[PDB]
Design a protein around this ligand. Structure first.
Ligand SMILES: Cn1cc(Br)cc(N)c1=O
Length: 129
């Protein structure tokens, strides 16, 4: 894509130690699955293309970009060590949305719908085996 967008967040790095936990499996099989398929998922399924969306200040404001495309790749490619790292990525995606966009903008209502499902699922994050 455009050189004016940053490189996406890292999804592969052999230097970072990896593990596959029952909680990370839940995060892919329940949490990501639930949000990915939601009618409102599409703005969150890949990094923000600030060029295409004509948001030139997006990456001036948002210095910790995250999206569900990146999280899906992280989960499928076993990038994470623990559930907290993955939960932190989802919370970053939501907070970035609420910081950048005006409250009650469509994008905000979409994030809110996903976040509601997210909280319900995360309260049921299984005990670590
Ligand atoms: C996350 N997200 C996605 C799209 Br599309 C447009 C935005 N303003 C945004 O914040």
């Amino acid at each position: 894509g455009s050189h004016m967008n940053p490189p996406p967040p890292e999804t592969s790095n052999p230097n970072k130690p990896k593990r596959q936990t029952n909680q990370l499996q839940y995060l892919l099989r329940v949490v990501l699955k639930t949000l990915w398929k939601h009618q409102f998922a599409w703005p969150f399924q890949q990094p923000v293309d600030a060029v295409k969306l004509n948001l030139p200040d997006y990456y001036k404001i948002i210095k910790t970009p995250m999206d569900m495309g990146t999280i899906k790749k992280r989960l499928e490619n076993n990038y994470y060590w623990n559930a907290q790292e993955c939960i932190q990525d989802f919370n970053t995606m939501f907070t970035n949305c609420y910081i950048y966009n005006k409250p009650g903008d469509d994008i905000v209502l979409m994030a809110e719908a996903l976040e509601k499902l997210f909280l319900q699922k995360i309260n049921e994050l299984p005990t670590e085996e």
